[PDB]
Coordinates of C-alpha atoms and ligand atoms in Angstrom, one line a residue:
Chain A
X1 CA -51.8 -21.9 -82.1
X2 CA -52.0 -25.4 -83.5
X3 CA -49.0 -26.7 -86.3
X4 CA -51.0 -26.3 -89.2
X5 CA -50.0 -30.0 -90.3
X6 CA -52.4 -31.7 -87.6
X7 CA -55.1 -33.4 -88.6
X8 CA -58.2 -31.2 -87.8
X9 CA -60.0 -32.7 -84.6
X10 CA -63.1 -31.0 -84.6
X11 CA -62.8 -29.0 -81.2
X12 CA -61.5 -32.2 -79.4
X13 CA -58.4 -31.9 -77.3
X14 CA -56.3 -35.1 -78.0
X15 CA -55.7 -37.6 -81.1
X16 CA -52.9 -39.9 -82.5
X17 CA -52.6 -39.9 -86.0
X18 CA -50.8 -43.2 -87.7
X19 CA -48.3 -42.0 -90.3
X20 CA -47.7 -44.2 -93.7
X21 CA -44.2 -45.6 -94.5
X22 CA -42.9 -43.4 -97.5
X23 CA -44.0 -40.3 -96.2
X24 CA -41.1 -38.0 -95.5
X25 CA -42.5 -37.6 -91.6
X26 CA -42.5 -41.6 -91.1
X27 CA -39.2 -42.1 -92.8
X28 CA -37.1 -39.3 -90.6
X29 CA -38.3 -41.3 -87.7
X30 CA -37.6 -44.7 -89.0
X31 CA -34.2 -43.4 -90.2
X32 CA -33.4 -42.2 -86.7
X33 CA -34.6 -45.0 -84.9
X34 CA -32.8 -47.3 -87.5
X35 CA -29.4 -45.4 -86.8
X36 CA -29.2 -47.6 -83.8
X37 CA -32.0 -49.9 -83.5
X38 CA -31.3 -52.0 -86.9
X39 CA -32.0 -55.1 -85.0
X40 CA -35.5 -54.6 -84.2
X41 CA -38.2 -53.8 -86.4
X42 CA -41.2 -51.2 -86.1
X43 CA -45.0 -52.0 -86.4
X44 CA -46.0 -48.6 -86.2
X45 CA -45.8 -44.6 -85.8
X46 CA -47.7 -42.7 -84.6
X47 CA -47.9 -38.4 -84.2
X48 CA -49.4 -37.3 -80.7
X49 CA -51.3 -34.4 -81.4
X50 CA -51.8 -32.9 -77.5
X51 CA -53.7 -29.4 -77.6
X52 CA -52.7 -28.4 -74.0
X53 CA -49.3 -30.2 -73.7
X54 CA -48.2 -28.4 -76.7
X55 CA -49.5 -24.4 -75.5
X56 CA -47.9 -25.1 -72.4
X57 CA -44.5 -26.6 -73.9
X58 CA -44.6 -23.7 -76.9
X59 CA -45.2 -21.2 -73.6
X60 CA -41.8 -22.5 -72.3
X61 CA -39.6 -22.9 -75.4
X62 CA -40.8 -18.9 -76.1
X63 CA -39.7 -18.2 -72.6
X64 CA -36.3 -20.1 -72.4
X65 CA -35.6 -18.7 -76.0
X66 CA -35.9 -15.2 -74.7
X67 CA -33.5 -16.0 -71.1
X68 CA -30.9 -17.8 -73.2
X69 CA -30.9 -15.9 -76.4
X70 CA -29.2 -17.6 -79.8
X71 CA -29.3 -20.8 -78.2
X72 CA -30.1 -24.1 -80.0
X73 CA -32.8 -25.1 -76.9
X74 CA -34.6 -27.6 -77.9
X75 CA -33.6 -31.6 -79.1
X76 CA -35.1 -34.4 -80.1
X77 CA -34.8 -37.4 -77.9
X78 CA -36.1 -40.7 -77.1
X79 CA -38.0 -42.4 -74.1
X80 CA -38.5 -45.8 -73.5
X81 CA -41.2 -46.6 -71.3
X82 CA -44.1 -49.9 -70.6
X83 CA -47.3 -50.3 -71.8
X84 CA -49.2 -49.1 -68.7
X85 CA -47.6 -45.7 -68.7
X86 CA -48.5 -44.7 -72.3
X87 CA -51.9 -43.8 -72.2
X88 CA -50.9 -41.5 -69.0
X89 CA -47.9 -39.7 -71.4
X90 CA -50.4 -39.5 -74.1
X91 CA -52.8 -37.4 -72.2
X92 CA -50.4 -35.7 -69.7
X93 CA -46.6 -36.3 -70.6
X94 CA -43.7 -36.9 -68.4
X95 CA -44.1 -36.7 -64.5
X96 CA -41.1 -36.5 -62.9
X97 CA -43.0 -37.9 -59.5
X98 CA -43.9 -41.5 -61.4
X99 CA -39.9 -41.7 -63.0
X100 CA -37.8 -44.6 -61.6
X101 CA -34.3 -44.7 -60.2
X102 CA -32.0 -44.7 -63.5
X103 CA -28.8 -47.3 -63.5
X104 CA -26.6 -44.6 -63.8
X105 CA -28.2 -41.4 -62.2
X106 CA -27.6 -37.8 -62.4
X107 CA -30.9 -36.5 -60.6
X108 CA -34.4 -37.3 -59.4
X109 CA -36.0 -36.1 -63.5
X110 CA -37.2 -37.8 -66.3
X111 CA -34.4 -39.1 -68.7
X112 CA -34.2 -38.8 -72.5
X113 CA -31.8 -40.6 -74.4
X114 CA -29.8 -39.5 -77.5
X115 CA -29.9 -43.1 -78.9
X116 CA -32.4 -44.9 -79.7
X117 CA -30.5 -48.1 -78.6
X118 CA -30.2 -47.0 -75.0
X119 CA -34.5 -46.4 -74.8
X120 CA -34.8 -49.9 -76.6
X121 CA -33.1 -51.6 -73.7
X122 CA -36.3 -54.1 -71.8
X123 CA -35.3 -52.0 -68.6
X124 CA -36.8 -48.6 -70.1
X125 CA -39.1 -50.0 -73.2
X126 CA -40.6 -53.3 -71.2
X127 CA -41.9 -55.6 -73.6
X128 CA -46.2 -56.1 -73.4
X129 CA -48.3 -59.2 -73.0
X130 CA -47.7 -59.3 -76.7
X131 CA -44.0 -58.6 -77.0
X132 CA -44.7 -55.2 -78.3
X133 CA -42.2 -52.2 -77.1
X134 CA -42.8 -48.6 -76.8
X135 CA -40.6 -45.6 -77.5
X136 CA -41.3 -41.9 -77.6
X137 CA -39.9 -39.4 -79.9
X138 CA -39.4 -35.9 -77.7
X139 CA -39.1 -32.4 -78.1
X140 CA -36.9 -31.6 -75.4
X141 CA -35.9 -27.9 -74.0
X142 CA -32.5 -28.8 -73.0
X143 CA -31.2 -25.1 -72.9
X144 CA -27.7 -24.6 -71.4
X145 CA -27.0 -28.0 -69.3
X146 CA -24.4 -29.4 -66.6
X147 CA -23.0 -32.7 -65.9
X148 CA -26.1 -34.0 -63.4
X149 CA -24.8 -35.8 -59.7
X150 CA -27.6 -38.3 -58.1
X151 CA -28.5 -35.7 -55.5
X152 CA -30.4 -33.0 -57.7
X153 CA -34.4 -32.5 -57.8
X154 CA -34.2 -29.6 -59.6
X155 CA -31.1 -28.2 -61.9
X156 CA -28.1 -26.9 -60.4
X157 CA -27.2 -23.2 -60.4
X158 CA -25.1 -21.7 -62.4
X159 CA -23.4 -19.5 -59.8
X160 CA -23.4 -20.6 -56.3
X161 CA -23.3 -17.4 -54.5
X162 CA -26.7 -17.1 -57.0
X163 CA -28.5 -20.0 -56.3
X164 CA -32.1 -19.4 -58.0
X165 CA -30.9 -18.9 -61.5
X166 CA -30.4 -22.4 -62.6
X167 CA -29.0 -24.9 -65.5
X168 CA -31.9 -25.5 -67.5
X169 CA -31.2 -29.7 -67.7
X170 CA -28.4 -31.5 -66.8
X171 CA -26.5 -34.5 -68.6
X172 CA -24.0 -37.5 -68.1
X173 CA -21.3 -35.8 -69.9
X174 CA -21.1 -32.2 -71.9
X175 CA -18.5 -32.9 -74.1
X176 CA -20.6 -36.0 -75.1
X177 CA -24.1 -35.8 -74.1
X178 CA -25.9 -39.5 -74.2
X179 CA -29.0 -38.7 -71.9
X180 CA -30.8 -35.6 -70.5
X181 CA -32.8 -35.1 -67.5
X182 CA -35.7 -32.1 -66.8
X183 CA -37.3 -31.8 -63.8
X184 CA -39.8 -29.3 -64.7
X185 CA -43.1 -30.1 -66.1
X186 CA -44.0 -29.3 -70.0
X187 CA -40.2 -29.1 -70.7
X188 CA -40.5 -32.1 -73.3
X189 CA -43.8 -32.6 -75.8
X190 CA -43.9 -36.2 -76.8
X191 CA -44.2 -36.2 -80.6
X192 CA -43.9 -39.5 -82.0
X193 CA -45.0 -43.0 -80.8
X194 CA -43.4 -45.7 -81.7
X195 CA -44.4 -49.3 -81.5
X196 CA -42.1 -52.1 -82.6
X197 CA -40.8 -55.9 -82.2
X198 CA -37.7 -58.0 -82.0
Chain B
X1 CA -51.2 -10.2 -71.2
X2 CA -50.0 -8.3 -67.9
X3 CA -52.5 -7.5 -64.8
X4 CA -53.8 -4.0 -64.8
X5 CA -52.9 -3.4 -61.4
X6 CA -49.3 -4.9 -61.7
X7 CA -46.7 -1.7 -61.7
X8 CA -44.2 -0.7 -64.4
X9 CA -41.4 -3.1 -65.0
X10 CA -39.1 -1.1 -66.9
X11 CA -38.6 -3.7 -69.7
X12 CA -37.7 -6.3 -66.8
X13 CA -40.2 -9.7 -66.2
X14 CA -39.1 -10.1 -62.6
X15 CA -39.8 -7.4 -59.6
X16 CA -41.1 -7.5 -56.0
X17 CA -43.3 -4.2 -55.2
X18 CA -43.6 -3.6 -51.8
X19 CA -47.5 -2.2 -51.3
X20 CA -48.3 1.1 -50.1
X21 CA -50.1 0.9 -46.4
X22 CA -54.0 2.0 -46.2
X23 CA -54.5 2.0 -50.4
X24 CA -57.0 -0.3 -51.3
X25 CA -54.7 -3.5 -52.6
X26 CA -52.7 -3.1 -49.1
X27 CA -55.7 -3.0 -47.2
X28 CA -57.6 -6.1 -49.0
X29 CA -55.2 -8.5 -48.5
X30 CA -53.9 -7.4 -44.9
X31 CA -58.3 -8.1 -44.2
X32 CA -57.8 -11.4 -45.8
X33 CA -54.9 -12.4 -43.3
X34 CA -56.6 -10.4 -40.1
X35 CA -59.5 -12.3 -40.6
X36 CA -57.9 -15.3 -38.2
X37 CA -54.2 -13.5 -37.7
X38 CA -55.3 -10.1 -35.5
X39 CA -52.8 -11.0 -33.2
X40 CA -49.9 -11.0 -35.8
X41 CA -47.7 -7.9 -36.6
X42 CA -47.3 -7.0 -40.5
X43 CA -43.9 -5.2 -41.1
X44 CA -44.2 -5.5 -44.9
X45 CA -46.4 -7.0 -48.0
X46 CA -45.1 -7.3 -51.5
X47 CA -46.6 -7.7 -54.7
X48 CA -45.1 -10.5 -56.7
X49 CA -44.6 -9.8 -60.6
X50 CA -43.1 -13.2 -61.8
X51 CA -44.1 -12.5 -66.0
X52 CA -42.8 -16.3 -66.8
X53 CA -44.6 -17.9 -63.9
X54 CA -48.2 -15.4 -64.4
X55 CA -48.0 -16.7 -68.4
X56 CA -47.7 -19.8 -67.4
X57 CA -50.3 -20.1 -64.9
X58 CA -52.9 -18.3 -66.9
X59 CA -52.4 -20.8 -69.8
X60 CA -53.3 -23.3 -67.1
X61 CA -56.0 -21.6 -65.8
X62 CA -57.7 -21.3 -69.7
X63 CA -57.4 -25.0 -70.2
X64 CA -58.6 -25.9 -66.7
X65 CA -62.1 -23.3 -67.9
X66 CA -62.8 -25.2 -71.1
X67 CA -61.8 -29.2 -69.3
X68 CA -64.5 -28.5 -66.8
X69 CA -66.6 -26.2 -69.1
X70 CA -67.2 -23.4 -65.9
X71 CA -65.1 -20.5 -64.9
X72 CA -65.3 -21.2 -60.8
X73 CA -61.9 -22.8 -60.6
X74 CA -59.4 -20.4 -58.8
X75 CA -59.3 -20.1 -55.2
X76 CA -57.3 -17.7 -52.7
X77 CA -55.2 -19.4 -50.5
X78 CA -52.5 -19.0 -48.0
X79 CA -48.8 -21.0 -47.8
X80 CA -46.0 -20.5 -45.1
X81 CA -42.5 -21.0 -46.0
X82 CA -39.2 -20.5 -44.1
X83 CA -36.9 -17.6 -45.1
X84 CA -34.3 -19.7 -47.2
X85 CA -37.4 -21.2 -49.5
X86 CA -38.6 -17.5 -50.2
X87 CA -36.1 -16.6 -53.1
X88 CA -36.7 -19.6 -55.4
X89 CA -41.0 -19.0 -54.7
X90 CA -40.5 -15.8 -55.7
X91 CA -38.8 -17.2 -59.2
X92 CA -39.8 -20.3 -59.9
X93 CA -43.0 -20.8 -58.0
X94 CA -44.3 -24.0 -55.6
X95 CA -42.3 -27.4 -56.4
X96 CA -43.9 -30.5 -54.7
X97 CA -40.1 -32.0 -55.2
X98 CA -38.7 -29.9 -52.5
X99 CA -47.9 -35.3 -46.8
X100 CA -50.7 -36.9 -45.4
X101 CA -53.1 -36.4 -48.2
X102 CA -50.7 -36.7 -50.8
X103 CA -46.8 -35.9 -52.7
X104 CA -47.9 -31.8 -53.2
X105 CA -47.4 -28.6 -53.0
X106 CA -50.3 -27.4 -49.7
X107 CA -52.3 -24.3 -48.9
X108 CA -54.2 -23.4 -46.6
X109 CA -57.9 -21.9 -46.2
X110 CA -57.2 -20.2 -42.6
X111 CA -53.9 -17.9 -42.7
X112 CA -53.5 -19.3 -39.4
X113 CA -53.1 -22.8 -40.3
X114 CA -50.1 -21.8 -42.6
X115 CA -49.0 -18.9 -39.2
X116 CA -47.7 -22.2 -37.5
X117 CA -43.9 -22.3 -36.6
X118 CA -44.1 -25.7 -38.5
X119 CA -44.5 -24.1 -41.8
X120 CA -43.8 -20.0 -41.8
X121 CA -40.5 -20.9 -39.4
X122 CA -39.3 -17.7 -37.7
X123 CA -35.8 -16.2 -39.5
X124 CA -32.5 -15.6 -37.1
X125 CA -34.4 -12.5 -36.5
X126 CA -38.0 -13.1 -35.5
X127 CA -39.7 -12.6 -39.4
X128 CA -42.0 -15.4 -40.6
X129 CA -43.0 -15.3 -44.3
X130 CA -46.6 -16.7 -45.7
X131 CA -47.5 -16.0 -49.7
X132 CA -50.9 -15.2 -50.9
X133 CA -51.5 -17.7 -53.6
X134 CA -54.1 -18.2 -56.5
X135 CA -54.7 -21.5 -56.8
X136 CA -56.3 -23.9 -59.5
X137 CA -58.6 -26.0 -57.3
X138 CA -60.7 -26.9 -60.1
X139 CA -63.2 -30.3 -58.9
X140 CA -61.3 -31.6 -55.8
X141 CA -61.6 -34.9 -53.8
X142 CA -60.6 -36.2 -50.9
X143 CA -57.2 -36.9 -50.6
X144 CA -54.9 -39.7 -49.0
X145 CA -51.5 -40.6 -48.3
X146 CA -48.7 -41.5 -51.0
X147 CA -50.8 -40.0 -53.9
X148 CA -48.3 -38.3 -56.4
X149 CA -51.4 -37.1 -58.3
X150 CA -55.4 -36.3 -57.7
X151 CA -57.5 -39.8 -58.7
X152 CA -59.3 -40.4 -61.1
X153 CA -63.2 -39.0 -61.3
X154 CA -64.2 -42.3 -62.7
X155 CA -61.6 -45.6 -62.7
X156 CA -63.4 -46.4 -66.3
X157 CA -61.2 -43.5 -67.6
X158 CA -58.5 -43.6 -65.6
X159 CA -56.6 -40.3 -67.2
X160 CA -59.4 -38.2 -66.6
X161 CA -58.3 -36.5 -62.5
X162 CA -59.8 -34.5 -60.4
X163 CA -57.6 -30.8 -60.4
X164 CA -56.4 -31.1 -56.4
X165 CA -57.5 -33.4 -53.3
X166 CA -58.3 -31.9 -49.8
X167 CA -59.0 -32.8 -46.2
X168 CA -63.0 -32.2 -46.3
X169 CA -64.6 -32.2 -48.9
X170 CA -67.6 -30.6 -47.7
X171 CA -65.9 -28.3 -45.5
X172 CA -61.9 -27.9 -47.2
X173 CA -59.4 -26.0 -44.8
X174 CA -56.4 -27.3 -46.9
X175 CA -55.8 -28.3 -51.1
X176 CA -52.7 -30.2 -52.5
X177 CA -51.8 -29.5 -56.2
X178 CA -49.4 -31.6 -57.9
X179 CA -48.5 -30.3 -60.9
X180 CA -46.1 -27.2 -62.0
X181 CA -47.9 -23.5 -62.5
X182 CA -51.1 -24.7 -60.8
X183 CA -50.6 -21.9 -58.2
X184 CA -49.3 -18.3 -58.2
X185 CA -47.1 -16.5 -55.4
X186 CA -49.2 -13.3 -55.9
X187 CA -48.4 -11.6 -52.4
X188 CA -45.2 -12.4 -49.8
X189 CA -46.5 -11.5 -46.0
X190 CA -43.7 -10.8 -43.8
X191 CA -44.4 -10.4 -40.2
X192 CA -43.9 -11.3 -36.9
X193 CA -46.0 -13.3 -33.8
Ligands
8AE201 N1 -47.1 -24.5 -45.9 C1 -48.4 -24.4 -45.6 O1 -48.9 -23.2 -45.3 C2 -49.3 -25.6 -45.3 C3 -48.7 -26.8 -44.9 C4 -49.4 -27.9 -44.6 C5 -50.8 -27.8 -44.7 O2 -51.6 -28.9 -44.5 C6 -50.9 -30.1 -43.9 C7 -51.9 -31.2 -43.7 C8 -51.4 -32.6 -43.2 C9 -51.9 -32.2 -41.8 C10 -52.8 -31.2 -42.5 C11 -51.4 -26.6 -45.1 C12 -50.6 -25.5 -45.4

């Protein structure tokens, strides 16, 4: 069920494609990036083209887009992270198990940021041996989401004299929203790669 | 792509289906569990139809046949739960966020291994409660404490992992998966010691 805009791998599983500057693709993720990272400056981008992270993450979106019905599920986010996680996201994506503490946290998930700005921070994108910081663009199934408390390893319920039918994410604020956090596996595809430099 | 042997949902993608005693479904998996729990009491099994959880699963299971290029990756296995756990099984599966060989969900070879107290915990009322599960096994090692996934096959590619880690891997009487829709609820024991 590939997006017929991949590059064709030739019956392999996993390739990153780097995207040229002028192409509408590159420049909606420099724009977006830009919106609130002006100060820094990107090296690269490049498209993450994951056979089985992407069946299992289109197997989700199809089933959260029949439960919810008319929603807007899915966003697209950004995650900081160091150099020695990448090629571990690349191949496998997000693990909630390997996620650290965040600053300011609303459950035991992995966190997605609206801004770009917040993911740049050297907490979340750690700078490399060569000052080179990394930053994921995410498709993220956000659903129908709650304000998160530090507690949660899963999303709350909805109901709590129903307590397996649950929030699909949760958030800092819903009027608001400035980060997300899942706690389900294949809930966010990592799309884009971007490398860049102070 | 629903199982043949699954019973009408009436447009529904969630239902328990308590088995009919001496058919042929009833009577293989009771075998499976008299096998090492003949002194056990069965008051009920159940059939667990979970659409979401069975799609997502097989999608798994597809992958996991073309990664290791063989078909020989599922395995049969047993895991007890207390009473207040059974409801969210039931919907949403085995969640290694809720250990001596590892940060996992466990299953056990020997139904009575997962028959311990320690795991199937009697209810207010006497019930314990163990699920039959298919699980992706796939090529397991040994495992070892604090692991939040399998190891690598080979540290000179070290994003290629085994599917599960075990106690013996010679002679396995329990696996630990660590990853979501590795392993399907596909029967709920209830019984009594
Ligand atoms: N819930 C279960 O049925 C269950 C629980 C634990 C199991 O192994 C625990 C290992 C550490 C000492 C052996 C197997 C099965």
């Amino acid at each position: 069920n590939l997006p017929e805009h991949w590059t064709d791998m030739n019956h392999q599983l996993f390739c990153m494609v780097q995207l040229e500057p002028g192409q509408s693709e590159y420049n909606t993720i420099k724009d977006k990036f830009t919106r609130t990272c002006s100060s820094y400056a990107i090296e690269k981008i490049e498209r993450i083209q994951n056979a089985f992270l992407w069946q299992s993450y289109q197997v989700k979106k199809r089933q959260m887009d029949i439960k919810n019905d008319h929603k807007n599920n899915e966003r697209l986010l950004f995650h900081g992270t160091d150099a020695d996680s990448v090629p571990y996201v690349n191949q496998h994506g997000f693990n909630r198990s390997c996620a650290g503490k965040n600053a300011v946290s609303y459950g035991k998930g992995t966190y997605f940021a609206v801004d770009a700005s917040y993911s740049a921070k050297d907490t979340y994108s750690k700078p490399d041996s060569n000052g080179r910081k990394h930053m994921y663009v995410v498709r993220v199934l956000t659903g129908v989401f709650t304000k998160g408390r530090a507690g949660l390893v899963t999303p709350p319920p909805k109901n709590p004299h129903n307590p397996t039918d649950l929030f699909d994410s949760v958030t800092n604020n819903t009027r608001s929203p400035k980060l997300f956090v899942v706690f389900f596996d294949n809930q966010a595809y990592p799309e884009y790669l971007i490398t860049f430099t102070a």
